[PDB]
Amino acid sequence: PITKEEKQKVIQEFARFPGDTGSTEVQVALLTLRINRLSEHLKVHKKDHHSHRGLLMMVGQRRRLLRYLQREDPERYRALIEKLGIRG
Amino acid sequence: QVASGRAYIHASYNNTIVTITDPDGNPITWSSGGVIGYKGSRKGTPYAAQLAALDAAKKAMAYGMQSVDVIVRGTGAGREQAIRALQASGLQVKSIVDDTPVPHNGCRPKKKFR
């Protein structure tokens, strides 16, 4: 699983001010971390369709947040998705 | 020859088969609702199980069998009559234990039993 230490690195490397824990960046970053851990888990467990639903829900959630940050900051949007290597 | 042994009552809704064994469970003798001339539905009645038990003990006691531990299987209507008969036969019924096979939800039963 994700441990508390790796999870804080994600908040640290993406907080706007070193106290922030809920901005779009730290949310996209936290989701991106759940996805790839899950995305990899599904690549091994191909019949775990229930968890895959979780994968889609996080993907949609991040996509909605990424849709929001592109409205308020096309610059910071671009800055975020590159640091997460996201587009495709 | 042996003195003590075990008495087994396999008894379904069809018949009641009594076999008396020895301490090691090796059968000394046996009987059932067929050994007394019943064929068919009658083989499953209480009276059939009584005569079956009486013919079981009277055959085993005729081998020196004196004490029996009564192991009971099944649920047929000749079950209780068999135990009663074993205490009236002359045997020193030293025990009664119900060892009816019950699965922990195992093999799918026939349609008759689902």
Partner: protein
């Protein structure tokens, strides 16, 4: 007479406590119901699982025969 009364303070997960746990099995080896166990809903699930473990470790029977 319920078992939660007939016993002091015990740990519902020590699957190695035969003396505590065996008190929760009928004369015929079955896991007693709450009407005998006296445990709550949440307690009953914990007890059964740890009973189930102890059966696998050979500490508790899966079934005993019935004596008269």
């Amino acid at each position: 007479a319920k078992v939660k009364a007939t016993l002091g303070e015990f740990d519902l997960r020590d699957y190695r406590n035969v003396e505590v746990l065996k008190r929760f099995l009928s004369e015929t080896g079955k896991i007693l119901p709450r009407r005998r166990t006296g445990l709550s809903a949440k307690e009953q699930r914990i007890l059964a699982k740890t009973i189930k473990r102890a059966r696998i470790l050979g500490l508790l029977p899966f079934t005993e025969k019935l004596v008269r």
